[PDB]
Write a protein that binds this ligand. Structure first.
Ligand SMILES: CCCCCC/C=C\CCCCCCCC(=O)O
Ligand SMILES: *[C@@H]1O[C@H](CO)[C@@H](O)[C@H](O)[C@H]1NC(C)=O
Ligand SMILES: *[C@@H]1O[C@H](CO)[C@@H](O)[C@H](O)[C@H]1NC(C)=O
Length: 116
């Protein structure tokens, strides 16, 4: 039911187990791993200490045996991250990615993670 996380940067987080498809709809960890690399400069810059967790919880969501669904981030965390990191993307010609639209997440804990 609940496969371990083969993706490198999400490794020693709060949680160590996942279940595809993720909150982007993709079925393969190798895909998520690829789509995470695009954010490495953003992580390097440190616009938000919650960015790594937030991104991991989206692309490689928490799986527990007790729950049937993948557990992503609470909208609140997303908002906080977006507030800190969206300006960094805009100054370089980009925007907040659609796949990270805070509307597609539950507000507070529907169950979700709120932080580390
Ligand atoms: C996903 C967020 C991206 C963060 C914003 C990008 C930051 C700097 C962009 C500089 C682009 C130049 C890349 C250098 C190319 C090279 O060194 O070969
Ligand atoms: C992560 O998984 C290991 C086993 O793979 C487990 O022992 C550990 O409790 C998990 N993490 C946390 C925070 O419990
Ligand atoms: C976020 O989701 C809402 C609700 O579906 C949608 O109206 C909105 O267009 C999405 N975000 C963007 C930037 O389009």
């Amino acid at each position: 039911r609940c496969d371990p996380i083969r993706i490198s940067m999400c490794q020693n987080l709060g949680y160590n187990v996942t279940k595809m498809p993720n909150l982007v709809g993709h079925e393969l960890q190798t895909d998520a791993e690829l789509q995470l690399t695009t954010f490495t400069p953003l992580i390097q810059y440190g616009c938000s200490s919650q960015l790594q967790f937030f991104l991991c919880s989206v692309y490689v969501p928490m799986c527990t045996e007790k729950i049937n669904i993948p557990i992503g981030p609470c909208g609140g965390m997303c908002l906080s991250v977006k507030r800190r990191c969206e300006p960094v993307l805009k100054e370089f010609g980009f925007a907040w990615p659609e796949s990270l639209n805070c509307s597609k997440f539950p507000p507070q804990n529907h169950m979700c993670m709120e932080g580390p």
